[PDB]
């Protein structure tokens, strides 16, 4: 019988964000520099305002930065993970959650997860910042456990059900993504309800253009980042039907479950409606699943962690729905490669012009794998835990201690 | 025509919480000292764990502390408000939300509100911590506007629809509250699902005892603080029916909309089911309202603010439902006194043994009104803004600047 150490210390650092270096990248996908496609007139709930139409950074999509949580066992072995929360995430970990973590067995992952959820229920809002922090802790625990046992997380979960993960790429250049070997390209919408028919025409034209350049079998999708309403989304979906748009994603703010139900009903035959990257907690996904949307897309570092993701996958599978996580690099890879209902995954372009395979969480993760020819072979994930190390060369800040 | 100044500065401070003096009280109702009824074996989602059964403080219900937001106009006049968020709340205000606040007209309240909601949608979780912060800013803006104009908020909203507010008291001594003139007493449950039939018998006996001591017309209610499940809540409701329990409150975690719908359908004839203090954003309340519960109880400082509260009131009124806010002191009084569908209000006992009328937000609010024989006449509220001043004697901390 293998002997397991207890958890000795949990620490939290951050990089980027409003109190550090802007454009740090890492865990915060949107903490980028200038001239980045991810900040290029992307439609949002705020783009209706002239001062916040051109840049999401201008309204503060980058204020949080990256949260880093590292758990150390009594035998000095460490595990860690990253997410979006930054300094505030550090407060929550160092001043609150540490009490449920330290002293526990490295295998007490689900127990710590339940305690974190129960203890923060009064201020977590079931998603966002607080849940992102909880997720980071959950992931750091799985990493530590795997590194202690000496097994990749995907094997602890029950093994891979496919020999490689195939990816679609999210970014402004589906055509370049096809050349790279991805199976599809998801583009962000640039116009919203306030732009009316002109907005619909322009984004639909963008899709038509890529369909011409990419051929019929390369998938094309639209990401709407909570920026629309039911009528606008319905018009855009129908305007893109002639081009076989595979799915239209996150058209509405997360609380609008009733709206999603209606939008799905209004969708063109065969076109899928998806959402979920901003939802958190298993119960929220139960409600989301019942709206009838086709694919739920939780972010492993935002939905509650791997522990929660695995439950969401089961929920989707029980209904014949698919689960395709939002980015998340290795934190998603080790999980989805074991899900029969996750036939493909997402690679969210961090490359400013979507022309190169810059790592998903560059540069906070050392030896972070990237898709090669649009795929990641399971052997690439054959490393303890989530298989990566923390890049301490980055300027990690420790705002709190205990 | 009255001339209005622009907003010049917004600042945030905090007292109590994990990074300050424990038990500071103020905005955080649960940041109390020892031997307080509010921490005496109260049933919670965590009380199933032996180490967290006796005290909520033990799992961290008091880590946030009080957030204080003060907005200063170009003419040097100021407005402020308090809520539960502490240090992290200050980060959000000083490092993100300030951009939408400063430079605006003191009358641009709804505009700033929409911008705060839209800009934080990606990390707010539609409730909890981030929403508490947004709420505090919203209230500070209303306070400032009312003080600049020279009118009480209740008059800006369209005046009182009742000459006085009648209160029920929340605490361990309904019998004493009756002596104080209250119209009813709401008691917290001490046992949960894991305690089974014994737990139900005990809390039911507690109600039975107070019924005998308070008479038939004095209302009695149970607060369950998200600690139960449908079956347990149903058993307790029926076990308390013989004593004419007026309502059973927040039996389930906030995301369990479907559970609330079933519970309301299972409730004894005439007994009401309520919830809402932990919900945030108007859209969440739309979903909550559709479950059919009788009363929605948002906390003005947590639901999104007064701007949101007024919308929730209309939503409930359109359906014939009631809106009875959670505590909130003056932030509720000025709003509810104008709502036809808020026939009574809540006074959450801050007195350790519920023997005195210690102010709702003691001691952060100078000259804070309290019910006089269970009531607060509109004349008490006839002061600019929310009619109170900040207690600068408290050890306010300014963790961030901009
Ligand atoms: Mg997306
Ligand atoms: Mg309550």
Short mmCIF file of N, CA and C in Angstrom, two decimals, chain A residues 97-212:
data_model
loop_
_atom_site.label_atom_id
_atom_site.label_comp_id
_atom_site.label_asym_id
_atom_site.label_seq_id
_atom_site.Cartn_x
_atom_site.Cartn_y
_atom_site.Cartn_z
N UNK A 97 -9.55 30.01 2.44
CA UNK A 97 -9.50 28.60 2.04
C UNK A 97 -8.36 27.76 2.60
N UNK A 98 -7.26 28.39 2.98
CA UNK A 98 -6.13 27.65 3.51
C UNK A 98 -6.53 26.74 4.68
N UNK A 99 -7.50 27.18 5.47
CA UNK A 99 -7.93 26.40 6.63
C UNK A 99 -8.52 25.03 6.31
N UNK A 100 -9.05 24.87 5.09
CA UNK A 100 -9.64 23.59 4.68
C UNK A 100 -8.62 22.72 3.95
N UNK A 101 -7.56 23.36 3.47
CA UNK A 101 -6.51 22.68 2.71
C UNK A 101 -5.39 22.07 3.54
N UNK A 102 -4.67 22.91 4.27
CA UNK A 102 -3.54 22.45 5.08
C UNK A 102 -3.92 21.41 6.13
N UNK A 103 -3.10 20.37 6.25
CA UNK A 103 -3.35 19.32 7.21
C UNK A 103 -4.05 18.11 6.62
N UNK A 104 -4.70 18.30 5.47
CA UNK A 104 -5.43 17.23 4.79
C UNK A 104 -4.48 16.26 4.08
N UNK A 105 -5.00 15.09 3.72
CA UNK A 105 -4.21 14.12 2.97
C UNK A 105 -4.23 14.63 1.53
N UNK A 106 -3.17 14.37 0.78
CA UNK A 106 -3.12 14.82 -0.61
C UNK A 106 -4.24 14.19 -1.45
N UNK A 107 -4.87 13.14 -0.92
CA UNK A 107 -5.95 12.48 -1.64
C UNK A 107 -7.33 13.00 -1.24
N UNK A 108 -7.39 13.91 -0.27
CA UNK A 108 -8.67 14.46 0.19
C UNK A 108 -9.18 15.57 -0.73
N UNK A 109 -9.02 15.39 -2.04
CA UNK A 109 -9.44 16.40 -3.00
C UNK A 109 -10.93 16.75 -3.02
N UNK A 110 -11.79 15.75 -3.12
CA UNK A 110 -13.23 16.02 -3.16
C UNK A 110 -13.77 16.61 -1.86
N UNK A 111 -13.14 16.25 -0.74
CA UNK A 111 -13.54 16.77 0.56
C UNK A 111 -13.23 18.27 0.62
N UNK A 112 -12.00 18.62 0.26
CA UNK A 112 -11.59 20.02 0.27
C UNK A 112 -12.46 20.82 -0.70
N UNK A 113 -12.80 20.21 -1.83
CA UNK A 113 -13.63 20.89 -2.81
C UNK A 113 -15.01 21.23 -2.22
N UNK A 114 -15.63 20.26 -1.55
CA UNK A 114 -16.94 20.47 -0.95
C UNK A 114 -16.87 21.52 0.16
N UNK A 115 -15.79 21.50 0.93
CA UNK A 115 -15.65 22.46 2.02
C UNK A 115 -15.46 23.87 1.46
N UNK A 116 -14.70 23.99 0.38
CA UNK A 116 -14.49 25.30 -0.23
C UNK A 116 -15.83 25.86 -0.73
N UNK A 117 -16.63 25.01 -1.37
CA UNK A 117 -17.93 25.43 -1.89
C UNK A 117 -18.88 25.82 -0.76
N UNK A 118 -18.96 24.98 0.26
CA UNK A 118 -19.84 25.28 1.37
C UNK A 118 -19.46 26.52 2.15
N UNK A 119 -18.16 26.72 2.36
CA UNK A 119 -17.68 27.87 3.12
C UNK A 119 -17.73 29.21 2.40
N UNK A 120 -17.75 29.19 1.07
CA UNK A 120 -17.78 30.43 0.30
C UNK A 120 -19.14 30.70 -0.33
N UNK A 121 -20.09 29.80 -0.13
CA UNK A 121 -21.42 29.96 -0.72
C UNK A 121 -22.04 31.33 -0.46
N UNK A 122 -21.79 31.91 0.71
CA UNK A 122 -22.38 33.21 1.04
C UNK A 122 -21.82 34.40 0.26
N UNK A 123 -20.71 34.21 -0.46
CA UNK A 123 -20.16 35.32 -1.25
C UNK A 123 -19.56 34.92 -2.60
N UNK A 124 -19.72 33.66 -2.99
CA UNK A 124 -19.14 33.21 -4.27
C UNK A 124 -19.99 33.55 -5.48
N UNK A 125 -21.29 33.77 -5.27
CA UNK A 125 -22.17 34.06 -6.39
C UNK A 125 -22.25 32.91 -7.38
N UNK A 126 -21.80 31.73 -6.96
CA UNK A 126 -21.84 30.54 -7.83
C UNK A 126 -21.10 30.68 -9.17
N UNK A 127 -20.06 31.50 -9.20
CA UNK A 127 -19.32 31.66 -10.44
C UNK A 127 -18.43 32.88 -10.41
N UNK A 128 -17.65 33.08 -11.46
CA UNK A 128 -16.78 34.23 -11.51
C UNK A 128 -15.58 34.12 -10.59
N UNK A 129 -15.06 35.29 -10.21
CA UNK A 129 -13.88 35.43 -9.36
C UNK A 129 -13.67 34.39 -8.26
N UNK A 130 -14.64 34.26 -7.36
CA UNK A 130 -14.52 33.31 -6.27
C UNK A 130 -14.44 31.86 -6.76
N UNK A 131 -15.26 31.51 -7.74
CA UNK A 131 -15.24 30.15 -8.26
C UNK A 131 -13.94 29.88 -9.03
N UNK A 132 -13.39 30.92 -9.66
CA UNK A 132 -12.13 30.78 -10.39
C UNK A 132 -11.03 30.40 -9.41
N UNK A 133 -11.08 31.01 -8.23
CA UNK A 133 -10.10 30.77 -7.19
C UNK A 133 -10.24 29.35 -6.66
N UNK A 134 -11.48 28.93 -6.42
CA UNK A 134 -11.74 27.58 -5.93
C UNK A 134 -11.23 26.57 -6.96
N UNK A 135 -11.47 26.86 -8.23
CA UNK A 135 -11.03 25.98 -9.32
C UNK A 135 -9.51 25.85 -9.34
N UNK A 136 -8.82 26.97 -9.14
CA UNK A 136 -7.37 26.96 -9.15
C UNK A 136 -6.86 26.05 -8.03
N UNK A 137 -7.49 26.13 -6.86
CA UNK A 137 -7.08 25.28 -5.75
C UNK A 137 -7.34 23.81 -6.09
N UNK A 138 -8.52 23.52 -6.62
CA UNK A 138 -8.88 22.16 -6.99
C UNK A 138 -7.86 21.56 -7.96
N UNK A 139 -7.47 22.36 -8.95
CA UNK A 139 -6.51 21.91 -9.95
C UNK A 139 -5.12 21.72 -9.35
N UNK A 140 -4.72 22.60 -8.44
CA UNK A 140 -3.42 22.46 -7.81
C UNK A 140 -3.38 21.17 -6.99
N UNK A 141 -4.51 20.80 -6.39
CA UNK A 141 -4.60 19.58 -5.59
C UNK A 141 -4.47 18.33 -6.46
N UNK A 142 -5.14 18.32 -7.61
CA UNK A 142 -5.06 17.17 -8.50
C UNK A 142 -3.63 17.04 -9.01
N UNK A 143 -2.99 18.18 -9.28
CA UNK A 143 -1.62 18.19 -9.77
C UNK A 143 -0.69 17.57 -8.73
N UNK A 144 -0.84 18.01 -7.48
CA UNK A 144 -0.02 17.50 -6.39
C UNK A 144 -0.23 16.00 -6.19
N UNK A 145 -1.50 15.58 -6.15
CA UNK A 145 -1.83 14.17 -5.96
C UNK A 145 -1.20 13.30 -7.05
N UNK A 146 -1.32 13.73 -8.31
CA UNK A 146 -0.74 12.98 -9.40
C UNK A 146 0.78 12.93 -9.33
N UNK A 147 1.38 14.06 -8.96
CA UNK A 147 2.84 14.12 -8.86
C UNK A 147 3.34 13.25 -7.70
N UNK A 148 2.53 13.10 -6.66
CA UNK A 148 2.90 12.26 -5.52
C UNK A 148 2.78 10.78 -5.89
N UNK A 149 1.68 10.44 -6.55
CA UNK A 149 1.43 9.06 -6.96
C UNK A 149 2.34 8.67 -8.11
N UNK A 150 2.70 9.65 -8.93
CA UNK A 150 3.56 9.40 -10.07
C UNK A 150 2.76 9.04 -11.31
N UNK A 151 1.55 9.59 -11.41
CA UNK A 151 0.69 9.32 -12.56
C UNK A 151 0.08 10.57 -13.16
N UNK A 152 -0.17 10.55 -14.48
CA UNK A 152 -0.77 11.72 -15.12
C UNK A 152 -2.20 11.75 -14.61
N UNK A 153 -2.79 12.93 -14.53
CA UNK A 153 -4.16 13.05 -14.07
C UNK A 153 -5.10 12.22 -14.94
N UNK A 154 -4.86 12.20 -16.25
CA UNK A 154 -5.77 11.46 -17.12
C UNK A 154 -5.85 9.97 -16.78
N UNK A 155 -4.77 9.40 -16.25
CA UNK A 155 -4.81 7.99 -15.88
C UNK A 155 -5.53 7.78 -14.55
N UNK A 156 -5.38 8.73 -13.63
CA UNK A 156 -6.06 8.62 -12.34
C UNK A 156 -7.57 8.62 -12.58
N UNK A 157 -8.01 9.38 -13.58
CA UNK A 157 -9.42 9.50 -13.92
C UNK A 157 -10.04 8.30 -14.63
N UNK A 158 -9.23 7.35 -15.08
CA UNK A 158 -9.79 6.21 -15.77
C UNK A 158 -9.24 6.01 -17.17
N UNK A 159 -8.18 6.74 -17.50
CA UNK A 159 -7.53 6.60 -18.79
C UNK A 159 -8.13 7.29 -20.00
N UNK A 160 -7.34 7.38 -21.07
CA UNK A 160 -7.79 8.01 -22.30
C UNK A 160 -8.75 7.09 -23.05
N UNK A 161 -9.69 7.69 -23.78
CA UNK A 161 -10.64 6.93 -24.57
C UNK A 161 -10.38 7.21 -26.04
N UNK A 162 -9.27 7.90 -26.30
CA UNK A 162 -8.84 8.24 -27.65
C UNK A 162 -7.32 8.46 -27.58
N UNK A 163 -6.62 8.16 -28.67
CA UNK A 163 -5.16 8.29 -28.68
C UNK A 163 -4.61 9.70 -28.88
N UNK A 164 -5.47 10.62 -29.31
CA UNK A 164 -5.04 12.00 -29.51
C UNK A 164 -6.24 12.93 -29.40
N UNK A 165 -5.96 14.17 -29.02
CA UNK A 165 -7.01 15.16 -28.91
C UNK A 165 -6.94 16.01 -30.18
N UNK A 166 -8.06 16.14 -30.88
CA UNK A 166 -8.11 16.97 -32.08
C UNK A 166 -8.70 18.32 -31.68
N UNK A 167 -8.15 19.38 -32.24
CA UNK A 167 -8.56 20.73 -31.89
C UNK A 167 -9.12 21.60 -33.00
N UNK A 168 -9.94 22.57 -32.60
CA UNK A 168 -10.43 23.58 -33.52
C UNK A 168 -9.71 24.78 -32.91
N UNK A 169 -9.52 25.85 -33.67
CA UNK A 169 -8.81 27.00 -33.13
C UNK A 169 -9.69 28.23 -33.03
N UNK A 170 -9.56 28.95 -31.93
CA UNK A 170 -10.35 30.16 -31.76
C UNK A 170 -9.46 31.36 -32.05
N UNK A 171 -9.91 32.20 -32.98
CA UNK A 171 -9.12 33.36 -33.35
C UNK A 171 -9.65 34.01 -34.62
N UNK A 172 -8.98 35.07 -35.06
CA UNK A 172 -9.39 35.81 -36.24
C UNK A 172 -8.99 35.20 -37.58
N UNK A 173 -8.18 34.14 -37.56
CA UNK A 173 -7.74 33.54 -38.81
C UNK A 173 -8.00 32.04 -39.00
N UNK A 174 -9.27 31.67 -39.25
CA UNK A 174 -9.62 30.26 -39.47
C UNK A 174 -8.81 29.67 -40.64
N UNK A 175 -8.53 30.50 -41.64
CA UNK A 175 -7.77 30.04 -42.80
C UNK A 175 -6.35 29.63 -42.44
N UNK A 176 -5.71 30.39 -41.56
CA UNK A 176 -4.36 30.05 -41.12
C UNK A 176 -4.42 28.81 -40.23
N UNK A 177 -5.52 28.68 -39.48
CA UNK A 177 -5.69 27.53 -38.59
C UNK A 177 -5.84 26.25 -39.40
N UNK A 178 -6.49 26.33 -40.55
CA UNK A 178 -6.66 25.15 -41.37
C UNK A 178 -5.28 24.67 -41.83
N UNK A 179 -4.43 25.61 -42.21
CA UNK A 179 -3.08 25.26 -42.67
C UNK A 179 -2.32 24.59 -41.54
N UNK A 180 -2.59 25.01 -40.31
CA UNK A 180 -1.91 24.43 -39.15
C UNK A 180 -2.42 23.03 -38.81
N UNK A 181 -3.54 22.63 -39.40
CA UNK A 181 -4.07 21.30 -39.14
C UNK A 181 -5.26 21.20 -38.22
N UNK A 182 -5.78 22.34 -37.75
CA UNK A 182 -6.94 22.31 -36.87
C UNK A 182 -8.14 21.83 -37.68
N UNK A 183 -9.17 21.36 -37.00
CA UNK A 183 -10.37 20.85 -37.66
C UNK A 183 -11.44 21.91 -37.90
N UNK A 184 -11.23 23.10 -37.34
CA UNK A 184 -12.20 24.16 -37.50
C UNK A 184 -11.70 25.47 -36.92
N UNK A 185 -12.45 26.53 -37.17
CA UNK A 185 -12.07 27.84 -36.67
C UNK A 185 -13.27 28.60 -36.15
N UNK A 186 -13.16 29.08 -34.92
CA UNK A 186 -14.22 29.84 -34.28
C UNK A 186 -13.75 31.28 -34.22
N UNK A 187 -14.54 32.16 -34.82
CA UNK A 187 -14.24 33.58 -34.87
C UNK A 187 -15.15 34.33 -33.92
N UNK A 188 -14.67 35.47 -33.40
CA UNK A 188 -15.48 36.26 -32.49
C UNK A 188 -16.33 37.20 -33.32
N UNK A 189 -17.51 37.57 -32.82
CA UNK A 189 -18.34 38.53 -33.54
C UNK A 189 -17.76 39.90 -33.19
N UNK A 190 -17.90 40.86 -34.09
CA UNK A 190 -17.36 42.19 -33.87
C UNK A 190 -18.45 43.26 -33.72
N UNK A 191 -19.68 42.89 -34.05
CA UNK A 191 -20.80 43.83 -33.96
C UNK A 191 -21.90 43.27 -33.07
N UNK A 192 -22.76 44.14 -32.56
CA UNK A 192 -23.83 43.68 -31.68
C UNK A 192 -25.19 44.25 -32.00
N UNK A 193 -26.19 44.00 -31.13
CA UNK A 193 -27.57 44.48 -31.30
C UNK A 193 -27.68 45.93 -31.76
N UNK A 194 -26.89 46.81 -31.16
CA UNK A 194 -26.92 48.23 -31.51
C UNK A 194 -26.50 48.52 -32.96
N UNK A 195 -25.84 47.56 -33.59
CA UNK A 195 -25.41 47.73 -34.98
C UNK A 195 -26.46 47.23 -35.96
N UNK A 196 -27.51 46.60 -35.43
CA UNK A 196 -28.60 46.12 -36.26
C UNK A 196 -28.25 45.25 -37.46
N UNK A 197 -28.98 45.46 -38.55
CA UNK A 197 -28.79 44.69 -39.77
C UNK A 197 -27.39 44.82 -40.36
N UNK A 198 -26.79 46.00 -40.22
CA UNK A 198 -25.44 46.21 -40.73
C UNK A 198 -24.47 45.29 -39.97
N UNK A 199 -24.67 45.19 -38.66
CA UNK A 199 -23.81 44.35 -37.85
C UNK A 199 -23.94 42.89 -38.25
N UNK A 200 -25.18 42.46 -38.49
CA UNK A 200 -25.45 41.09 -38.89
C UNK A 200 -24.78 40.82 -40.23
N UNK A 201 -24.95 41.76 -41.15
CA UNK A 201 -24.36 41.63 -42.49
C UNK A 201 -22.85 41.48 -42.44
N UNK A 202 -22.19 42.30 -41.63
CA UNK A 202 -20.74 42.27 -41.52
C UNK A 202 -20.18 40.99 -40.91
N UNK A 203 -20.75 40.54 -39.80
CA UNK A 203 -20.23 39.31 -39.21
C UNK A 203 -20.55 38.11 -40.09
N UNK A 204 -21.71 38.12 -40.75
CA UNK A 204 -22.08 37.02 -41.63
C UNK A 204 -21.13 37.00 -42.84
N UNK A 205 -20.74 38.18 -43.30
CA UNK A 205 -19.82 38.29 -44.44
C UNK A 205 -18.46 37.72 -44.04
N UNK A 206 -18.07 37.94 -42.79
CA UNK A 206 -16.81 37.43 -42.28
C UNK A 206 -16.83 35.91 -42.34
N UNK A 207 -17.96 35.32 -41.98
CA UNK A 207 -18.11 33.87 -42.01
C UNK A 207 -18.10 33.37 -43.45
N UNK A 208 -18.84 34.05 -44.33
CA UNK A 208 -18.90 33.66 -45.73
C UNK A 208 -17.50 33.66 -46.35
N UNK A 209 -16.73 34.69 -46.04
CA UNK A 209 -15.37 34.82 -46.56
C UNK A 209 -14.50 33.63 -46.15
N UNK A 210 -14.56 33.26 -44.88
CA UNK A 210 -13.76 32.14 -44.41
C UNK A 210 -14.22 30.81 -44.97
N UNK A 211 -15.52 30.67 -45.22
CA UNK A 211 -16.05 29.43 -45.78
C UNK A 211 -15.48 29.27 -47.19
N UNK A 212 -15.36 30.39 -47.89
CA UNK A 212 -14.83 30.36 -49.25
C UNK A 212 -13.36 29.95 -49.20
#
